[PDB]
Amino acid sequence: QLKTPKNVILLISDGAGLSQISSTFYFKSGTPNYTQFKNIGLIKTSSSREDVTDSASGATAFSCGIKTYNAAIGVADDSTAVKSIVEIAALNNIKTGVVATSSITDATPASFYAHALNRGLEEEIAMDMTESDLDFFAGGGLNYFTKRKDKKDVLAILKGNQFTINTTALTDFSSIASNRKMGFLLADEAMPTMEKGRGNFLSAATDLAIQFLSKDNSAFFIMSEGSQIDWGGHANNASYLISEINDFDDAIGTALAFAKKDGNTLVIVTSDHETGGFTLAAKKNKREDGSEYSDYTEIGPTFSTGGHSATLIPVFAYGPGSEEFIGIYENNEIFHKILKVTKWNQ
Amino acid sequence: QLKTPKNVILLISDGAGLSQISSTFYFKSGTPNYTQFKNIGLIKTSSSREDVTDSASGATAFSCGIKTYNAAIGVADDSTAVKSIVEIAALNNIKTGVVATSSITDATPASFYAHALNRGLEEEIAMDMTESDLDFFAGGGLNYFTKRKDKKDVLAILKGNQFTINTTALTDFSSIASNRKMGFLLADEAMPTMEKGRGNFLSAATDLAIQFLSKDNSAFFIMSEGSQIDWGGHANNASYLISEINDFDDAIGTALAFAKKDGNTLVIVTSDHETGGFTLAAKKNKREDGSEYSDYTEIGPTFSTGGHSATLIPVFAYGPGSEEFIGIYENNEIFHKILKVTKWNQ
Numbered sequence: 219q220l221k222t223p224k225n226v227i228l229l230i231s232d233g234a235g236l237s238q239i240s241s242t243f244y245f246k247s248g249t250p251n252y253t254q255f256k257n258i259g260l261i262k263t264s265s266s267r268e269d270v271t272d273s274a275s276g277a278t279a280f281s282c283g284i285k286t287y288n289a290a291i292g293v294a295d296d297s298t299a300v301k302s303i304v305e306i307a308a309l310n311n312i313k314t315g316v317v318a319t320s321s322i323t324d325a326t327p328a329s330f331y332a333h334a335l336n337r338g339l340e341e342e343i344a345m346d347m348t349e350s351d352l353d354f355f356a357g358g359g360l361n362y363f364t365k366r367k368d369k370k371d372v373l374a375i376l377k378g379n380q381f382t383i384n385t386t387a388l389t390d391f392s393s394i395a396s397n398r399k400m401g402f403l404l405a406d407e408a409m410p411t412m413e414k415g416r417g418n419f420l421s422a423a424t425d426l427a428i429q430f431l432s433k434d435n436s437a438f439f440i441m442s443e444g445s446q447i448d449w450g451g452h453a454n455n456a457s458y459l460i461s462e463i464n465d466f467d468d469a470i471g472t473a474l475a476f477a478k479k480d481g482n483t484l485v486i487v488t489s490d491h492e493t494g495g496f497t498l499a500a501k502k503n504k505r506e507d508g509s510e511y512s513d514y515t516e517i518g519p520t521f522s523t524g525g526h527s528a529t530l531i532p533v534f535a536y537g538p539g540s541e542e543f544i545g546i547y548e549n550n551e552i553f554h555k556i557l558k559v560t561k562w563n564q
Numbered sequence: 565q566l567k568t569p570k571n572v573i574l575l576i577s578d579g580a581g582l583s584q585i586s587s588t589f590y591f592k593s594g595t596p597n598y599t600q601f602k603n604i605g606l607i608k609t610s611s612s613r614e615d616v617t618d619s620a621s622g623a624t625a626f627s628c629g630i631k632t633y634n635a636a637i638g639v640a641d642d643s644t645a646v647k648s649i650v651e652i653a654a655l656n657n658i659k660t661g662v663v664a665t666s667s668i669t670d671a672t673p674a675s676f677y678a679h680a681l682n683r684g685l686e687e688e689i690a691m692d693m694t695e696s697d698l699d700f701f702a703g704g705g706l707n708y709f710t711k712r713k714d715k716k717d718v719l720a721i722l723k724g725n726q727f728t729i730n731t732t733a734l735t736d737f738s739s740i741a742s743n744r745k746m747g748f749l750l751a752d753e754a755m756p757t758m759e760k761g762r763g764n765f766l767s768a769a770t771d772l773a774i775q776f777l778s779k780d781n782s783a784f785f786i787m788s789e790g791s792q793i794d795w796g797g798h799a800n801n802a803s804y805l806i807s808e809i810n811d812f813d814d815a816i817g818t819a820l821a822f823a824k825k826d827g828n829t830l831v832i833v834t835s836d837h838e839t840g841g842f843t844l845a846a847k848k849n850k851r852e853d854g855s856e857y858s859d860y861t862e863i864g865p866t867f868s869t870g871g872h873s874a875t876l877i878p879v880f881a882y883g884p885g886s887e888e889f890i891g892i893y894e895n896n897e898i899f900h901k902i903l904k905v906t907k908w909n910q
């Protein structure tokens with residue numbers, strides 16, 4: 219008989235396997251917020267058609283609770299729309315939010331508010347935002363709203379659906395407190411990398427979402443994504459990968475700090491899949507004649523692929539109901555477990 | 565307040581990171597015994613001097629509860645001998661056993677019964693067995709006992725210490741039930757690979773250990789090692805690694821079946837470190853005008869290093885006190901957690 223969380227925060231590190239997570243224990247100043255977690259599980263990430271998942275089916279597993287085909291956005295294997303956790307939350311009087319460091323129309327955020335046959339339909343996904351139940355969002359992707367191939371001004375449609383939109387910068391809570399809904403579109407495409415000075419966007423936007431969505435003692439659901447960990451993996455770029463997941467761990471600390479103060483909030487941290495075969499290998503030293511040998515004293519990150527991989531992925535959970543997330547299970551059970559512990563009407 | 569296990573079985577898969585574990589979910593017929601576990605933790609594996617651990621310091625962390633230098637066997641970072649869980653168990657009237665698919669003198673088993681300044685001293689390690697409290701062992705390494713630089717016959721010495729020794733084959737339990745202590749040395753060096761027909765030695769020997777040590781209602785501690793998973797990794801040989809870890813998972817099943825019936829047995833499964841950067845990457849195909857592309861429908865295992873890596877490592881625990889093993893901690897705490905739940909004293 220587990221406790222029942224009022225609020226849920228789901229943080230997704232795109233492309234972070236256990237090796238990526240491990241880098242925070244070696245390449246971050248201070249202890250990782252990961253260490254606050256006790257309840258840990260493992261998910262199997264394959265899609266309905268492919269051993270190696272993409273981000274679209276991976277996120278749809280979490281958001282909708284079904285295995286589906288790579289590239290699907292909130293649709294089942296037969297392409298029909300399926301009810302998402304955000305749509306359920308709305309029907310249970312729960313305020314909802316989505317934060318991302320990619321475009322807001324990218325596969326991960328999109329799976330939580332849109333229904334599209336293919337993740338590539340990003341202008342369609344943007345239009346879907348205007349019909350969604352979301353109360354808050356923050357990310358990049360201004361292009362998909364204001365510079366579209368179909369020349370439509372979707373920004374105007376957003377605002378005509380009760381969204382207050384800021385395209386300049388994240389503000390503080392008091393700035394937005396009296397708005398019905400709030401949207402931040404802070405880049406034309408993806409947000410800047412950490413190495414290009416994105417700073418504490420992910421944490422700040424998550425903290426802002428929490429304050430905005432908990433107005434009037436309301437319960438809330440938030441999904442925040444460390445989107446660019448995946449891109450570091452694809453590029454086989456260690457410093458990129460490392461700086462992005464270090465930022466994600468900061469966001470974890472933000473969520474957990476709120477949850478510990480609040481006492482009624484479940485925080486779930488997981489990834490959609492691993493990418494790059496990132497490995498914390500021994501540093502390579504080079505001698506005069508003999509060239510290369512391994513030095514176990516230090517780490518030199520290596521990669522083995524430019525794409526995703528099918529390893530099981532760690533799930534971390536803190537707060538009321540967090541015990542439900544231990545053991546080993548299919549990725550789509552994340553959805554069913556959130557539904558189970560919150561006791562929301564399906 | 566968790567429960568107190570009477571018996572402990574510690575199964576060590578040498579060199580198995582979560583990616584290696586994940587292979588059983590794709591390359592083994594039927595569901596992996598890993599799925600029986602609910603309580604899961606993670607360990608950091610660095611040694612006292614090295615970010616990337618070797619098998620000797622990694623295992624000594626488990627057996628003796630301290631961080632020590634790579635190559636150390638049952639000694640602290642300052643080289644002083646430290647009491648092992650086997651020695652502590654003996655003091656508490658617990659029966660003990662060690663099983664491995666490597667030579668029984670290899671770093672992992674050695675760390676549970678010997679104290680040596682360097683893991684390479686395997687003839688010294690074999691002699692250390694004679695002054696040990698071990699009641700049961702099974703593995704390769706006959707050469708270290710009978711073809712030595714000092715030309716001593718160590719089997720004779722063991723027999724004087726109440727050991728019955730078998731160098732022919734694993735036998736039925738009825739063949740050893742009345743022996744005071746039992747040792748099986750079934751190969752000159754390492755046991756054959758699974759690919760070369762080792763068969764169910766690891767599961768069979770663990771079952772034999774259990775039945776033998778639990779004679780007369782004595783409590784027991786057993787360490788059984790899937791030794792050759794690591795060697796598959798070093799060689800970057802996917803079929804080798806996979807077949808060895810599938811065998812290990814069978815041994816997990818053997819242990820769990822016993823523990824579930826017994827009800828007073830804690831089973832802990834973990835690894836000393838990862839090796840080879842093993843990755844369940846997408847299958848690679850070639851065109852013939854810019855060859856390589858990915859097919860996400862299938863897995864093509866890959867590696868990025870010939871050595872170990874420093875990723876955190878999953879810990880699985882089942883039985884009384886299993887909840888003590890969740891969260892994230894240093895590898896050497898495995899020792900302290902075992903002592904905590906068993907209440908085995910010093």
Ligand SMILES: [Mg+2]
Nearest residue numbers: 232273326445
């Ligand atoms: Mg993503």
Ligand SMILES: [Mg+2]
Nearest residue numbers: 455456457458
């Ligand atoms: Mg770089």
Ligand SMILES: [Mg+2]
Nearest residue numbers: 578619672791
């Ligand atoms: Mg070993």
Ligand SMILES: [Mg+2]
Nearest residue numbers: 801802803804
């Ligand atoms: Mg092979």
Ligand SMILES: [Zn+2]
Nearest residue numbers: 232233273490
């Ligand atoms: Zn992804």
Ligand SMILES: [Zn+2]
Nearest residue numbers: 233448452493
């Ligand atoms: Zn990707």
Ligand SMILES: [Zn+2]
Nearest residue numbers: 578579619836
């Ligand atoms: Zn090892």
Ligand SMILES: [Zn+2]
Nearest residue numbers: 579794798839
């Ligand atoms: Zn090794």
